[PDB]
Design a protein around this ligand. Structure first.
Ligand SMILES: *[C@@H]1O[C@H](CO)[C@@H](O)[C@H](O)[C@H]1NC(C)=O
Ligand SMILES: *[C@@H]1O[C@H](CO)[C@@H](O)[C@H](O)[C@H]1NC(C)=O
Ligand SMILES: *[C@@H]1O[C@H](CO)[C@@H](O)[C@H](O)[C@H]1NC(C)=O
Ligand SMILES: *[C@@H]1O[C@H](CO)[C@@H](O)[C@H](O)[C@H]1NC(C)=O
Ligand SMILES: *[C@@H]1O[C@H](CO)[C@@H](O)[C@H](O)[C@H]1NC(C)=O
Ligand SMILES: *[C@@H]1O[C@H](CO)[C@@H](O)[C@H](O)[C@H]1NC(C)=O
Lengths: 49, 325, 113, 49
């Protein structure tokens, strides 16, 4: 059925702000993402007459 | 409804034209869609929502005017509350002539939540949350990194931590007062609103024009004339009204393009100055950029840019190199 | 080139990219890095040694529980705190949260040998 | 990912679709009277002086 709902804005998350506590990475992941952009559009011409 | 105010005869005459109304509807629908997209691109950059920490002492740094006020009906920071109060029956008259306004997809509360999440993210983990997971960093160390980023050793920060926190806290208080007293501070957002209102008022106003017709009112044309004479008079009014709507839409499209450019810029600034640190000159404030904090506003975004400016200076002798042995 | 603009060339830290063509357009493949496993360590802004204050030159002071080391900011590769990893400026009285530790002097064993 | 996601290239597809509509509209707009007796010039000229 069609359901109505309030949208979620994002995942709930958290961090511990804390003085003298720091996180440091121990490993990494390489990822590749794709970005798409248009450059041109069909060139057309209309004869008025 | 704008053109043919519940007149069957007008509608049938309107149908002698091509798909005019369809094109106008497509243009306005397209604009409305873009307006929600712009909002999402500017604010919903981070989909992880962090809570504002309960510890209101970031190594001497305040931020209470920036962070949301938990005691209010709308969880706006003191600064945001001011911005909303400063930027500001005709709506019925417009409604009755077929001119309406659609709600935004995101509400002000939703925007405030995105803004708060970004602020919580930045205060807790600096820029790390914007490029991977959020890594907590003691606030003064986030500042140390930001100092190294502008060519000043971190030694300066630690030695002067109290001074820096005090100058910072004073600067924030000054902004809220500046916005409160300056009547033109939010003129850019007010101008957008004013232009849209004027464009709609113009459409309502032109309904009264005759355009060569005996009268502006279809009901009077129909109550006094026979069919073929009325058709001539009605067609004169239709032509005029079609032109009025077409003019409106063309301008509305041009204004929408301008706004997309503004929104794209705003999105860029957030990505580069809020979720990072920028080396671009005058991109995010005059002076050296350290960090930024977004605030929401009606129809837009307000950024607080924290920068450094060199102060007292002295005249010294210099030389390219030292000759030793 | 390699851009430092955040999210300009994609999410994470930008390394490089490769274009691909497309009908009426361009598609970019952006190679970026994202930090993965991470650990929480205790920290301090400086180390107090001989009464002088030592700051890391290119890193963060990290406490592993009973020992202090220096790591590069983006990766956990602990170094011994030595005089070649720090610089000294100011005394132990000014920096807030400075902790007492040993800074190793690499010359000492040669003086004794 | 590109192979499996049909919406992946929507940004380019949309350019194409919008320009197609712009031309389809011009062609369809030919079949209008605009107050004339017919949409076709040849019929107007064939029957009227
Ligand atoms: C350490 O990190 C874990 C996540 O890996 C988190 O659940 C925990 O609360 C953190 N502890 C502190 C003191 O920040
Ligand atoms: C911020 O300043 C106000 C006074 O303007 C004070 O009442 C409040 O406690 C301060 N908050 C912090 C975190 O320093
Ligand atoms: C120092 O700089 C100022 C300009 O800022 C100049 O007027 C002054 O003469 C200079 N003094 C010396 C000793 O060079
Ligand atoms: C970290 O602490 C443990 C003791 O808990 C010690 O055995 C180990 O050697 C220390 N790490 C390094 C790199 O020295
Ligand atoms: C860190 O937080 C604790 C909270 O108990 C406080 O006692 C301490 O003075 C704070 N500052 C430093 C530098 O440890
Ligand atoms: C560092 O050593 C001095 C020795 O006089 C002592 O007074 C001070 O409390 C020590 N500091 C810490 C953090 O242990």
């Amino acid at each position: 059925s069609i359901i109505a709902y309030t949208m979620s804005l994002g995942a709930e998350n958290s961090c511990a702000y804390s003085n003298n506590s720091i996180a440091i990475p121990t490993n990494f992941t390489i990822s590749v993402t794709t970005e798409i952009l248009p450059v041109s559009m069909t060139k057309t011409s209309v004869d008025c007459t | 409804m704008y053109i043919c105010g519940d007149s069957t005869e007008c509608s049938n005459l309107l149908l002698q034209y091509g798909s005019f109304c369809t094109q106008l509807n497509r243009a306005l629908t397209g604009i409305a869609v873009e307006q929600d997209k712009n909002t999402q691109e500017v604010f919903a950059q981070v989909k992880q929502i962090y809570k504002t920490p309960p510890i209101k002492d970031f190594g001497g740094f305040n931020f209470s005017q920036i962070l949301p006020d938990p005691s209010k009906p709308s969880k706006r920071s003191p600064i945001e509350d001011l911005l909303f109060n400063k930027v500001t029956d005709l709506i019925c008259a417009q409604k009755f002539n077929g001119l309406t306004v659609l709600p935004p997809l995101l509400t002000d509360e939703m925007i405030a939540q995105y803004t708060s999440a970004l602020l919580a993210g930045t205060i807790c983990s600096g820029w790390t949350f914007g490029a991977g997971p959020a890594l907590q960093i003691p606030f003064p160390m986030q500042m140390a990194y930001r100092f190294n980023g502008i060519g000043v050793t971190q030694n300066v920060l630690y030695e002067n931590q109290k001074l820096i926190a005090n100058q910072f806290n004073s600067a924030i208080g000054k902004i809220q007062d500046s916005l409160s007293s300056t009547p033109s501070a939010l003129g850019k957002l007010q101008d957008v609103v004013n232009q849209n209102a004027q464009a709609l008022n113009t459409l309502v106003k032109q309904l009264s024009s005759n355009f060569g017709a005996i009268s502006s009112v279809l009901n009077d044309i129909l109550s006094r004339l026979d069919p073929p004479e009325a058709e001539v008079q009605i067609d004169r009014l239709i032509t005029g009204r079609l032109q009025s709507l077409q003019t409106y839409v063309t301008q509305q499209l041009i204004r929408a393009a301008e706004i997309r450019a503004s929104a794209n810029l705003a999105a860029t600034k957030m990505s580069e100055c809020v979720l990072g640190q920028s080396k671009r000159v005058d991109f995010c404030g005059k002076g050296y950029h350290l960090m930024s904090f977004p605030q929401s506003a009606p129809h837009g975004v307000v950024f607080l840019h924290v920068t450094y400016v060199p102060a007292q200076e002295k005249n010294f002798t210099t030389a390219p190199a030292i000759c030793h042995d | 080139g390699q851009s430092k603009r955040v999210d300009f060339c994609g999410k994470g830290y930008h390394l490089m990219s490769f274009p691909q063509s497309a009908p009426h357009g361009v598609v970019f493949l952006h190679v970026t890095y994202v930090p993965a496993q991470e650990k929480n360590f205790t920290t301090a802004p400086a180390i107090c040694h001989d009464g002088k204050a030592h700051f890391p030159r290119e890193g963060v002071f990290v406490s592993n529980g009973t020992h202090w080391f220096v790591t590069q900011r983006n990766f956990y590769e602990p170094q011994i705190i030595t005089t070649d990893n720090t610089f000294v400026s100011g005394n132990c009285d000014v920096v807030i949260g400075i902790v007492n530790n040993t800074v190793y002097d690499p010359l000492q064993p040669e003086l004794d040998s």
